[PDB]
């Protein structure tokens, strides 16, 4: 076939998902993950009905701000302010080259965007956010992945996309993997 | 030239080394890092006189055994039992598929190889090993790397080796970068 195991994708030692899902592991401190955003945007819209796209923030980059940065991401999902906050965060760290030195500074990034302080403080330190970050980390450890960005299809298909022709072929590969179980 | 920036190698945002050094970031839990060993072996012997090869173990893989696994590696350098212990460790985790579940089990791996318990316990919990692991982590964070394996030349040249022809061309690239400052 056009997509062969060991060439276009690698099978992970994990139980396949009981439902179609495309997962992306990244970190706001990851440069190419920032460059990868436009491609991620198109891939979602290009996804077949029924499939869900899930972003997972890893905590190994950024030193002692890694874990906090993961909570911030988890906070964006909880507050549904993901569409505006993701680019704002990728931008303040890469383009502006002004990384949040601590929790209070990280918090300020949200406050400067209009997100209410009481809303942020409740979610940032909440159970939902805590449960989500743990889930982010566990999934990364269990998949045995060694870096980011990483796009896994149905929980066991690591897209070794370094061989795709155009963005068109890339979507064809992901779409192809979604049907395989 | 044969090796262009942004194609064969990427310049890192870090101060160049005051002396020729080839660094490899890896993890014993990293599969390709295991496959990469033979290539690492040849590259060292192929290195020009005066250059030093330094392995750096990262702690982000292996969950709560990551940090311990880094100390174990640092322990191998301290006890100069690196030549025998590196392959033994890559082998017990990958080929034998029997990962050390805890510190005592990790310790046992050494004890089963003839390394004296008193010697291991002194170094494993020693200042030298502690100073080395910290150094491993700091270097990884400062380089802004997003995965392993990763080969950096003179502290600021990330070998984007995914474009080299044969192993011969790879060595030519590394050797080429060592002269650049």
Instruction: Please report where in the chains the tokens 């964006």 appear, as a residue.
Output: A76
Q: Which two tokens stand for residue B27?
A: 């993890």
CATH number of the domain within which A146 lies: 3.40.30.10
**What does this entry list as its resolution, in Å?**
2.0
Q: Which two tokens stand for residue B62?
A: 């292996």
Pair A37, A87: CB distance under 8 Å: yes
Experimental method reported for this structure? X-ray
Q: How far apart are CA A11 and CA A152, in angstroms?
A: 10
Q: What is the DSSP letter of A136?
A: H
Partners of residue A60 in chain B, C-beta under 8 Å = 60
Nearest chain B residue (CA) to A60: B60
Say which residues have a Cβ less than 8 Å from residue A29's Cβ, sequence separation at least 6.
A61, A62, A66, A69, A93, A99, B144
Smallest CA–CA distance, residue B5 to chain A, in Å, is 16
Return the SS3 of B39: helix
Nearest chain B residue (CA) to A149: B146
Structural domain including B5 reads 1-181
Check chain B for breaks (C–N over 2.5 Å) and list the residue before each, or none: none
Nearest to A148 among B141, B147, B162 (CB): B147
Among B35, B59, B60, the strongest candidate for a mutation testing the A interface, having the largest count of A CBs within 10 A, is B60
Smallest CA–CA distance, residue A98 to chain B, in Å, is 15
Return the SS3 of B129: helix
In chain B the beta strands, taken as DSSP E runs, fall at: 9-11, 21-26, 52-57, 150-153, 157-159
Instruction: Please report where in the chains the tokens 């160049």 appear, as a residue.
Output: B16
CA distances in angstroms from B158 to A38, B112, B143, listed in the order given: 25, 37, 9
Q: How far apart are CA B148 and CA B128, in angstroms?
A: 24
Pair B163, B136: CB distance under 8 Å: no
B148:A148 CB<8 A = no
Residues in chain B: 181
Backbone angles phi, psi at B55, to 5 degrees: -90, 140
Partners of residue A32 in chain B, C-beta under 8 Å = 146
Residues in chain A: 181
Partners of residue A148 in chain B, C-beta under 8 Å = 146-147
Backbone angles phi, psi at B123, to 5 degrees: -70, -50
User: How many domains does chain B divide into?
Assistant: 1
């Amino acid at each position: 076939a056009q997509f062969k195991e060991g060439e276009h994708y690698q099978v992970l030692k994990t139980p396949a998902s009981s439902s179609p899902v495309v997962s992306e592991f990244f970190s706001f401190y990851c440069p190419h993950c920032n460059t990868f955003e436009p491609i991620i945007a198109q891939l979602k819209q290009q996804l077949p009905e029924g499939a869900k796209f899930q972003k997972n923030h890893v905590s190994f980059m950024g030193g002692n701000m890694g874990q906090a940065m993961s909570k911030a991401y988890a906070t964006m999902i909880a507050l549904e302010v993901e569409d505006k906050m993701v680019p704002v965060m990728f931008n303040r760290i890469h383009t502006l080259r002004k990384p949040p030195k601590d929790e209070q500074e990280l918090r300020q990034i949200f406050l400067d965007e209009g997100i209410d302080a009481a809303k942020f403080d409740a979610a940032y330190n909440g159970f939902a956010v805590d449960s989500m970050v743990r889930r982010f980390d566990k999934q990364f450890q269990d998949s045995g992945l060694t870096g980011v960005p990483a796009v896994v299809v149905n929980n066991r298909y690591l897209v070794q996309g370094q061989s795709v022709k155009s963005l068109d072929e890339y979507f064809d590969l992901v779409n192809y993997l979604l049907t395989l179980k």
